[PDB]
Amino acid sequence: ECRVLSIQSHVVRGYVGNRAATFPLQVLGFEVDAVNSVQFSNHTGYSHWKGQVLNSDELQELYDGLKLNHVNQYDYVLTGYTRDKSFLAMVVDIVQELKQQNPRLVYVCDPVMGDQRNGEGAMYVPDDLLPVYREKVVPVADIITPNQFEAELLTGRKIHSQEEALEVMDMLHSMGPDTVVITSSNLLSPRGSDYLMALGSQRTRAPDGSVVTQRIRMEMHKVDAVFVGTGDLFAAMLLAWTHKHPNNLKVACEKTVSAMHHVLQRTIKCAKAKSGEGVKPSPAQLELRMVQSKKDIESPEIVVQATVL
Amino acid sequence: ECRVLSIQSHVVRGYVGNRAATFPLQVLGFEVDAVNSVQFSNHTGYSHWKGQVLNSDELQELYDGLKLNHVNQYDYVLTGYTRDKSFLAMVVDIVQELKQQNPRLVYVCDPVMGDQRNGEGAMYVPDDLLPVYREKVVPVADIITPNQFEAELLTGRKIHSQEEALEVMDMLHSMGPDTVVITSSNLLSPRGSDYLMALGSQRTRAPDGSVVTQRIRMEMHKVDAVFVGTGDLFAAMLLAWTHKHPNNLKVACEKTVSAMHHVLQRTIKCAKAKSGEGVKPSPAQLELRMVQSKKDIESPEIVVQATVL
Numbered sequence A, B: 001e002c003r004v005l006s007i008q009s010h011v012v013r014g015y016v017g018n019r020a021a022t023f024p025l026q027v028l029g030f031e032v033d034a035v036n037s038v039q040f041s042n043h044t045g046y047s048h049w050k051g052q053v054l055n056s057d058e059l060q061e062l063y064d065g066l067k068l069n070h071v072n073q074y075d076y077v078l079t080g081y082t083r084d085k086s087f088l089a090m091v092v093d094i095v096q097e098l099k100q101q102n103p104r105l106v107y108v109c110d111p112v113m114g115d116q117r118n119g120e121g122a123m124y125v126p127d128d129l130l131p132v133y134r135e136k137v138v139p140v141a142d143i144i145t146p147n148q149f150e151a152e153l154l155t156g157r158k159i160h161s162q163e164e165a166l167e168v169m170d171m172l173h174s175m176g177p178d179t180v181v182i183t184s185s186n187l188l189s190p191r192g193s194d195y196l197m198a199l200g201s202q203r204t205r206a207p208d209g210s211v212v213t214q215r216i217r218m219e220m221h222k223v224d225a226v227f228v229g230t231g232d233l234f235a236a237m238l239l240a241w242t243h244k245h246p247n248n249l250k251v252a253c254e255k256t257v258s259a260m261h262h263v264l265q266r267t268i269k270c271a272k273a274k275s276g277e278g279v280k281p282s283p284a285q286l287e288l289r290m291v292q293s294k295k296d297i298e299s300p301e302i303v304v305q306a307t308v309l
């Protein structure tokens, strides 16, 4: 009984968008209904790319489809990278109707807007999207996973310290989502530039109306390469694991990251093993070795440690 | 090193076409590049259905895509149900260019045209397709899996006996494919109406230019229900297994069928378990329990026996 309505992009080759969130969620037993928001030959990181996009009407046509056949009832709804403002809107209407359809509907949303680097950040999607995510989308999500950049954008506040971070996540919680995980930061991790720091924070409702707030910090070993898709693979698995541990933003993230590691490490290798001695791996060689990593996606060898508060 | 270019239909919900051939081929480690020939909400067997189709030009646009990025090199190419004559054509041009690209390119083709029943058969695709499959498509395929009906149509000859069958398969081999498996027949199996007979035949080239021809017969236990997708799931796995046993149309089919059984039996059950005591299962309940059957798709418990000649 695990149905997910993943609305994301599809590529014929490679792993990005729905191609990066389906296989996982399936080997881990989730019945994944996937709506391809676009179908391109490969991700836009390649030199060339040809494909088509689904517009707001078309997306609609499909929703209705599932309606007419009374099968528009899901547990989780997962979304990520979108370029059309109008499209994203539609997606909200849907998630809405869909929630009245099932109270315990968890909307896992990766507010994809852009990347940063010490301040030198910038959106890679139209700016007319920031308003929707902030005003329409985020308000209804129940689990968001933004960048440092992305979280800074939504909150309109820049992060300088870890404490400021935890306070930017609180501003998020006060936006709707009871789960917020800043998948990666520029903050120097207490273990050196070699690592990558990530921050998580979950809000639970106390039996007396009070507040309970767990917080964590996982430092992952960085990998020297430009990877396309990790944003999607992460959100998927997080959704998976946070289902097994409905109340352990700590336990989940641990598994979620560990696998991310296993995948990336096997990826970079096979990738490097195809350009050995003197050449930078092409984006066509850095694609995620998903299939080859199934073994880990299911039985993740926890090789990280969540630190509370 | 297992890349497949599966050109088939996609549904948001359910398992038919590419949704029925991808998950399998992946859990069994094949890097599957999937081109969705159409994207509908659910298969056309439901009361309603809404969706869009990819035309010949659009399909082209994607091929080129993989071209410009020099990644148009696959091992296997898998196709099935197509409704557009023009579309199928395109698909041949591609498979062609693609074969010059890699000699050992195996084109696995399921010549989907229609179903039969003692003679009362009829195509469920435009008749303007029979000519292409017979003249253009089949000539280039290296592994076809037709119906009794479908094989009768291609050969233009009706099957009455088992011997006539083996002779209809020979007429196929003489069309191109060195592998032909009539996935199911009306021929009474030597074990009663309760079973389903299927026939396989592989042509190998002898080291002296002579002829070697293995032949088999597997009787599978029938299941009392109308299942959509089994045609696709079969072709996938056959492609999988006939890769491990490049020369044992016997060994392969055994595994291919066994799993088909496991899937169908678990499917019918969960399906029946949702309409218990007095109601016929809806097509919305008969969908294939794919995810739930991964365990078998990989470790198929051989519960059948291939009979040579």
Ligand SMILES: Nc1ncnc2c1ncn2[C@@H]1O[C@H](COP(=O)(O)OP(=O)(O)CP(=O)(O)O)[C@@H](O)[C@H]1O
Binding pocket: A115, A146, A147, A183, A184, A196, A198, A220, A221, A222, A223, A224, A225, A226, A227, A228, A229, A230, A231, A232, A234, A257, A260, A264
């Ligand atoms: N070069 C790298 N080294 C280590 N981990 C990396 C990595 N690239 C990605 N990751 C992993 O991917 C996850 C999310 O990555 P990140 O926070 O960079 O994504 P993002 O939101 O910028 C996504 P994208 O840019 O791909 O859309 C983290 O768990 C992180 O460990």
Ligand SMILES: Nc1ncnc2c1ncn2[C@@H]1O[C@H](COP(=O)(O)OP(=O)(O)CP(=O)(O)O)[C@@H](O)[C@H]1O
Binding pocket: B115, B146, B147, B183, B184, B196, B198, B220, B221, B222, B223, B224, B225, B226, B227, B228, B229, B230, B231, B232, B234, B257, B260, B264
């Ligand atoms: N009702 C049933 N009972 C037993 N096996 C069945 C079945 N329906 C399908 N199968 C299995 O599916 C495989 C192919 O089925 P079949 O020959 O009926 O397909 P087909 O080419 O008519 C496909 P479709 O009509 O679904 O496109 C066989 O291996 C067969 O065992």
Ligand SMILES: Cc1ncc(CO)c(CN)c1O
Binding pocket: A009, A010, A016, A017, A038, A040, A042, A043, A044, A045, A080, A081, A228, A229, A231, A232
């Ligand atoms: C088409 C497409 N989809 C999804 C992503 C990332 O989630 C990328 C890479 N920007 C992409 O090019």
Ligand SMILES: Cc1ncc(CO)c(CN)c1O
Binding pocket: B009, B010, B016, B017, B038, B040, B042, B043, B044, B045, B080, B081, B228, B229, B231, B232
């Ligand atoms: C859209 C679609 N694709 C594929 C198939 C069978 O391979 C069906 C069922 N006819 C279907 O409706």
Ligand SMILES: [K+]
Binding pocket: A110, A145, A146, A147, A183, A231
């Ligand atoms: K993120």
Ligand SMILES: [K+]
Binding pocket: B110, B145, B146, B147, B183, B231
């Ligand atoms: K068939």
Ligand SMILES: [Zn+2]
Binding pocket: A112, A113, A147, A231
């Ligand atoms: Zn991202």
Ligand SMILES: [Zn+2]
Binding pocket: B112, B113, B147, B231
């Ligand atoms: Zn068929």
